[PDB]
Amino acid sequence: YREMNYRHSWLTPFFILVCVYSAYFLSGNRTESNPLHMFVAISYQVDGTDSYAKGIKDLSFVFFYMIFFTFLREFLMDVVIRPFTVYLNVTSEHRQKRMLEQMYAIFYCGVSGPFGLYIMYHSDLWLFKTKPMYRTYPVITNPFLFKIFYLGQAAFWAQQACVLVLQLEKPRKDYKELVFHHIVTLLLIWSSYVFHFTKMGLAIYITMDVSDFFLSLSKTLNYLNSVFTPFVFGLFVFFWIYLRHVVNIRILWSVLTEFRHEGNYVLNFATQQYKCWISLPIVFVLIAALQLVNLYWLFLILRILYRLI
Amino acid sequence: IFNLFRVCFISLLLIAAVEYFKYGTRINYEWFHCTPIKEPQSGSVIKLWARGGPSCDKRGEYKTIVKRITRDYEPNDEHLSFCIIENDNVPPVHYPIHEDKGEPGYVAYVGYDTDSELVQELCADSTIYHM
Amino acid sequence: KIFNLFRVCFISLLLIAAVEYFKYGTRINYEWFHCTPIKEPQSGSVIKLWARGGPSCDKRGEYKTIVKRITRDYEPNDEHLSFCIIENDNVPPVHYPIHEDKGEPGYVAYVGYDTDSELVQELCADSTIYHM
Amino acid sequence: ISYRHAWIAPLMILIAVYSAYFTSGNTTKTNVLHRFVAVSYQIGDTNAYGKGINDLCFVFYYMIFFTFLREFLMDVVIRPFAIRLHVTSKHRIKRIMEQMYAIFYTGVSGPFGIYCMYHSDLWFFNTKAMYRTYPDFTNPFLFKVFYLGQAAFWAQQACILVLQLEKPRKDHNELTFHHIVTLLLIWSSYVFHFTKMGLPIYITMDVSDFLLSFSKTLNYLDSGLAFFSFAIFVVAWIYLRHYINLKILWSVLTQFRTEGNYVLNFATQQYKCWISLPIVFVLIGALQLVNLYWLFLIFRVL
Numbered sequence: 068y069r070e071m072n073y074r075h076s077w078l079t080p081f082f083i084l085v086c087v088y089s090a091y092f093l094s095g096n097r098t099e100s101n102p103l104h105m106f107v108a109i110s111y112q113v114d115g116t117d118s119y120a121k122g123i124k125d126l127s128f129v130f131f132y133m134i135f136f137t138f139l140r141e142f143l144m145d146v147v148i149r150p151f152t153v154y155l156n157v158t159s160e161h162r163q164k165r166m167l168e169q170m171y172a173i174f175y176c177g178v179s180g181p182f183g184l185y186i187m188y189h190s191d192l193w194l195f196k197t198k199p200m201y202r203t204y205p206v207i208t209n210p211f212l213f214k215i216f217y218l219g220q221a222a223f224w225a226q227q228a229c230v231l232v233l234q235l236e237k238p239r240k241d242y243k244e245l246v247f248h249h250i251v252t253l254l255l256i257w258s259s260y261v262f263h264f265t266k267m268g269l270a271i272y273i274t275m276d277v278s279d280f281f282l283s284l285s286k287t288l289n290y291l292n293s294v295f296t297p298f299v300f301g302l303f304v305f306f307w308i309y310l311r312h313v314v315n316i317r318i319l320w321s322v323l324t325e326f327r328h329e330g331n332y333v334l335n336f337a338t339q340q341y342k343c344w345i346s347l348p349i350v351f352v353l354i355a356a357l358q359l360v361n362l363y364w365l366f367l368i369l370r371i372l373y374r375l376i
Numbered sequence: 377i378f379n380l381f382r383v384c385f386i387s388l389l390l391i392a393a394v395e396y397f398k399y400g401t402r403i404n405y406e407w408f409h410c411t412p413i414k415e416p417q418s419g420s421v422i423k424l425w426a427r428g429g430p431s432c433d434k435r436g437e438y439k440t441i442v443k444r445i446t447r448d449y450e451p452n453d454e455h456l457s458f459c460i461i462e463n464d465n466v467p468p469v470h471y472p473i474h475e476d477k478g479e480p481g482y483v484a485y486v487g488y489d490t491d492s493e494l495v496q497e498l499c500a501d502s503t504i505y506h507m
Numbered sequence: 508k509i510f511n512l513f514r515v516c517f518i519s520l521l522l523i524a525a526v527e528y529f530k531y532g533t534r535i536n537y538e539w540f541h542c543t544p545i546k547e548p549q550s551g552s553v554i555k556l557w558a559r560g561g562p563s564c565d566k567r568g569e570y571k572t573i574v575k576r577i578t579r580d581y582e583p584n585d586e587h588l589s590f591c592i593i594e595n596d597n598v599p600p601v602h603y604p605i606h607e608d609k610g611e612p613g614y615v616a617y618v619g620y621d622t623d624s625e626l627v628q629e630l631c632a633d634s635t636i637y638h639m
Numbered sequence: 640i641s642y643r644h645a646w647i648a649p650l651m652i653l654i655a656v657y658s659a660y661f662t663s664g665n666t667t668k669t670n671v672l673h674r675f676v677a678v679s680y681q682i683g684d685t686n687a688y689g690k691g692i693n694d695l696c697f698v699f700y701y702m703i704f705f706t707f708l709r710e711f712l713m714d715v716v717i718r719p720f721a722i723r724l725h726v727t728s729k730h731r732i733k734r735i736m737e738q739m740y741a742i743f744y745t746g747v748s749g750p751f752g753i754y755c756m757y758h759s760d761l762w763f764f765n766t767k768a769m770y771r772t773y774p775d776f777t778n779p780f781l782f783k784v785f786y787l788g789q790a791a792f793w794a795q796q797a798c799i800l801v802l803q804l805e806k807p808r809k810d811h812n813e814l815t816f817h818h819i820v821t822l823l824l825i826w827s828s829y830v831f832h833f834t835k836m837g838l839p840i841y842i843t844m845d846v847s848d849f850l851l852s853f854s855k856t857l858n859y860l861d862s863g864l865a866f867f868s869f870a871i872f873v874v875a876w877i878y879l880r881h882y883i884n885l886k887i888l889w890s891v892l893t894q895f896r897t898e899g900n901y902v903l904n905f906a907t908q909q910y911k912c913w914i915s916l917p918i919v920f921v922l923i924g925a926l927q928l929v930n931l932y933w934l935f936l937i938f939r940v941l
């Protein structure tokens with residue numbers, strides 16, 4: 068019993084997840100009155116339309132899906148990702164360990180990436196349109212799939228930050244900057260969701276997801292010692308520039324100008340409208356720190372490109 | 377594992393603090409948006425109202441007026457006698473960005489017991505409350 | 508040793524400030540501690556609202572509780588308000604007794620939205636209506 | 640010379656503050672130094688003083704003043720007097736220094752306390768005046784000065800204890816608890832009113848400590864008056880810290896609810912209600928139990 072739990076660390080999260088889900092489905096209620104709905108699914112809904120509000124039960128959804136994502140990551144890595152790496156015949160233990168995380172990130176960013184593209188397509192934010200994120204501010208009520216995306220991503224990033232907090236592996240070289248990146252993920256997601264800046268963070272979710280997907284594909288192919296790595300790395304660097312820099316600079320420029328001139332700009336605490344002259348510096352700082360981190364990583368990628376050319 | 381508990385506690389404290397900040401700002405928006413004005417007439421009677429931006433609607437003016445009336449004056453020391461007059465000519469939200477503003481939506485005259493005769497004539501036909 | 512003294516002084520100052528703020532909040536927000544709002548709905552949005560409490564729930568506490576409930580439970584931004592506060596001049600400001608037989612409240616208010624503002628206007632009985 | 644005269648710097652600070660305050664002709668509430676030098680909040684010309692933040696500045700400034708007094712007394716008179724009594728042991732000299740400083744402080748405070756009571760309706764430790772005037776928003780000039788000075792002295796003692804300038808002490812255990820409970824009691828019985836109620840406890844503790852320190856000093860000198868001094872001390876102890884404290888506890892039990900008004904009223908800052916009676920009762924019962932423990936120590940010694 069405990070011997071399996073010592074190595075198969077996903078057994079306890081699997082048990083918790085399966086017991087919670089089985090109890091929720093066996094109860095037969097499947098409504099907001101069911102207090103397992105507070106954890107299993109998104110609770111606050113505005114009447115019958117696909118508009119979902121915010122509240123305390125959104126934190127418990129994050130808490131439960133943190134365990135969900137711990138289970139998913141550990142399960143995939145031990146039974147699916149690791150035998151797949153073994154089938155690739157990797158002769159280095161460290162390279163295999165790195166490939167484990169790289170393929171997990173590939174899966175997460177190839178699932179949530181297209182997820183972000185799909186939810187954006189069903190909105191007015193297609194092709195990272197600058198106007199929509201400030202037209203309807205404050206976005207008090209979130210759409211169904213939109214809120215699911217935000218809540219699941221928040222739970223996943225909180226889970227990753229917690230795992231990083233329980234330092235078990237040796238601190239890698241970018242641990243000084245990756246801890247800052249995790250901190251800024253949690254801060255940005257929690258501030259954008261709580262302070263009704265939820266439409267605007269999708270355009271930053273999507274660039275993140277796509278760039279990370281191609282970044283993890285590049286590391287996976289290099290660790291695999293594949294021959295098709297230069298083409299994939301070129302696609303990665305092109306899309307990295309376009310998304311994390313061109314689109315991010317467009318978003319920052321909208322924060323500079325389109326934050327004021329477009330949409331309601333007068334501060335109103337009564338209506339929970341925070342889009343004013345005070346939130347503009349806060350938002351610009353919170354996104355300019357991100358742009359500085361992305362610029363430092365662009366410098367690293369440029370150094371790599373110069374070395375390999 | 378104590379680092380995990382500390383990080384989770386700090387994150388939950390930050391979330392709760394920001395939620396309480398939002399709740400208090402929504403509840404007490406008249407403090408941030410409406411600036412009370414006390415224009416004394418004679419004795420303890422003051423012509424009291426508030427001014428601010430568009431966020432200082434009639435609700436904000438009324439809340440600021442009530443807060444000032446029940447705070448600056450102590451009924452236990454002496455029973456109050458005030459009134460609140462509504463400006464029907466303006467919409468519930470009328471204050472512009474410009475510093476000129478306009479006629480306030482809510483105007484209150486609040487005085488003590490010995491000044492009740494002054495506030496009664498100042499309120500004219502408006503209902504006079506006791507506190 | 509100096510750091511320990513600074514920490515002890517800071518803890519003592521925090522205790523003093525917390526107790527002073529507790530006193531200030533209790534004095535300013537005594538209507539929350541002593542007065543419990545009572546709502547008697549009469550329509551979709553019209554509710555007859557007053558407060559109940561002990562002798563410390565004076566007319567000032569009743570008025571503060573009524574105004575607080577009207578301005579918190581109703582959102583004029585979503586829909587413009589219409590209410591009126593009616594004095595019960597037959598009772599003193601300290602009318603409320605300690606026992607449960609409180610009696611007629613000193614302050615009673617009818618508050619509702621503008622779609623049913625006719626009911627509020629007819630319930631006020633010539634009292635001035637404070638649109639919000 | 641400040642290294643071996645610990646009172647040079649406090650004296651310089653005190654004299655600078657006093658000279659700056661006195662040289663200016665304002666010498667009233669408008670002066671900035673009135674926050675520290677003297678009691679600030681006064682309602683008109685009446686002999687009644689309110690409460691406020693400036694009292695904390697007074698507490699800190701007279702904490703510095705009592706630091707100066709504690710160092711200067713020992714450095715100028717107490718230590719030379721101890722040397723004059725042919726005392727040579729380091730422990731004996733050091734303990735006699737603190738005991739004689741306590742003698743002087745208590746013989747200044749306790750008589751001041753009884754004088755302040757004699758000018759009020761609290762004479763003979765009457766429990767009716769405890770709660771009849773509650774809440775006591777304003778207290779007389781002497782009543783507030785005595786309270787704030789005692790608070791400043793006890794805060795200075797607590798700061799000295801925390802500073803652990805001479806850490807090894809065998810009395811540290813109970814003395815630290817006494818200092819903490821004294822600071823808590825003074826601060827609570829000042830901010831939450833009950834200022835009239837804390838004076839009798841003030842007087843009992845001050846007089847009992849005065850006689851205790853007198854008996855202790857006589858014992859250290861090994862004089863023939865030690866037994867008589869200890870006898871009068873124990874008589875005053877059972878009269879003040881036990882009889883009067885039990886009378887005060889009985890007042891908290893049965894007279895706390897009757898006298899004055901018992902209904903809670905946060906609007907008038909009148910906290911004498913049914914959720915404050917347990918707090919005031921336990922906060923004095925703990926002190927009474929510690930006094931009973933010290934009485935057990937006295938009986939073991941006697």
Ligand SMILES: CCCCCCCCCCCCCCCCCC(=O)OC[C@H](COP(=O)(O)OCCN)OC(=O)CCCCCCCCCCCCCCCCC
Pocket residue numbers: 097107108109132139174175178179182185215216218219220
């Ligand atoms: C590596 C990433 C992948 C990890 C996630 C994979 C999830 C697979 C499914 C897991 C099991 C959960 C299934 C649903 C159980 C709860 C059922 C329930 O109560 O109803 C569905 C619930 C609410 O939906 P509904 O009922 O339609 O609400 C309206 C009410 N009539 O529905 C919900 O609230 C569902 C909440 C799901 C939250 C997902 C969190 C992560 C989000 C990002 C990745 C998910 C992308 C999946 C593909 C999307 C393609 C468009």
Ligand SMILES: CCCCCCCCCCCCCCCCCC(=O)OC[C@H](COP(=O)(O)OCCN)OC(=O)CCCCCCCCCCCCCCCCC
Pocket residue numbers: 120121122123125126127129130207208221222225226228229253256257260261339383384387388391392395399
């Ligand atoms: C590495 C660390 C990992 C930590 C994990 C979390 C990481 C960050 C994840 C991001 C999560 C974002 C969402 C968090 C909660 C947001 C709640 C919210 O937005 O509430 C808004 C609500 C007002 O609702 P709204 O519709 O805006 O207005 C209605 C009236 N017009 O406001 C309200 O008044 C609703 C009530 C809000 C109460 C919030 C309390 C927060 C603290 C709770 C402490 C206890 C938590 C218990 C569960 C967890 C622990 C077991």
Ligand SMILES: CCCCCCCCCCCCCCCCCC(=O)OC[C@H](COP(=O)(O)OCCN)OC(=O)CCCCCCCCCCCCCCCCC
Pocket residue numbers: 519520522523524527528530689690691692694695696698699776790791794822823825826829830908
């Ligand atoms: C470094 C030098 C300069 C230092 C400057 C100050 C720095 C620290 C600032 C702390 C701020 C918090 C304390 C003051 C808050 C504001 C209080 C105020 O404005 O006054 C309220 C009250 C008097 O008003 P009240 O009588 O209640 O109401 C009248 C009704 N119209 O006010 C009061 O009752 C205030 C009473 C304060 C002092 C009372 C305690 C005296 C004894 C202290 C003993 C030592 C400390 C003990 C600590 C606990 C034990 C460890």
Ligand SMILES: CCCCCCCCCCCCCCCCCC(=O)OC[C@H](COP(=O)(O)OCCN)OC(=O)CCCCCCCCCCCCCCCCC
Pocket residue numbers: 676677678701743744747748751780784785786787788789
């Ligand atoms: C061992 C000591 C233990 C003492 C136990 C009791 C604690 C008392 C507090 C410590 C000493 C306090 C000093 C005097 C009080 C200072 C506060 C004050 O307001 O002082 C009065 C004076 C200005 O007075 P004003 O307010 O203008 O008018 C009052 C009448 N309407 O303000 C001033 O500027 C006065 C400055 C000169 C004060 C001279 C001292 C007067 C006597 C005080 C009692 C004795 C304390 C010292 C004993 C030393 C014995 C050697």
Ligand SMILES: CCCC[C@@H](C)[C@@H](OC(=O)C[C@@H](CC(=O)O)C(=O)O)[C@H](C[C@@H](C)C[C@@H](O)CCCC[C@H](O)C[C@@H](O)[C@H](C)N)OC(=O)C[C@H](CC(=O)O)C(=O)O
Pocket residue numbers: 734817848851854855858859865866867869870933936937940941
């Ligand atoms: C051979 C003589 C020894 C006598 C000592 C055993 C005794 O002394 C006597 O009681 C006197 C004597 C008279 C007589 O002739 O009758 C007698 O009764 O024995 C003394 C203990 C008692 C005084 C008991 C007290 O402690 C308890 C009361 C504490 C109350 C709080 O403290 C209050 C304040 O503090 C607070 C800050 N507000 O023991 C000592 O502690 C002294 C020795 C001396 C030494 O040996 O050098 C030491 O430790 O230094």
Ligand SMILES: CCCC[C@H](C)[C@H](OC(=O)C[C@H](CC(=O)O)C(=O)O)[C@@H](C[C@@H](C)C[C@@H](O)CCCC[C@H](O)C[C@@H](O)[C@H](C)N)OC(=O)C[C@@H](CC(=O)O)C(=O)O
Pocket residue numbers: 245248279282285286287289290296297298299300364367368371374375
């Ligand atoms: C331990 C790093 C190994 C990564 C890859 C194996 C490979 O990195 C190396 O190659 C190692 C290299 C050694 C060298 O070769 O010189 C070196 O590190 O210096 C990669 C280079 C880039 C990925 C540069 C990275 O490091 C920095 C990335 C920063 C982004 C942030 O993390 C974002 C996240 O934080 C957040 C969660 N969103 O892609 C290639 O280069 C493959 C080649 C193969 C070829 O040449 O044949 C190609 O396809 O072009």
Ligand SMILES: [N+]
Pocket residue numbers: 407408409410411
């Ligand atoms: N303000």
Ligand SMILES: [N+]
Pocket residue numbers: 539540541542543
């Ligand atoms: N209450």
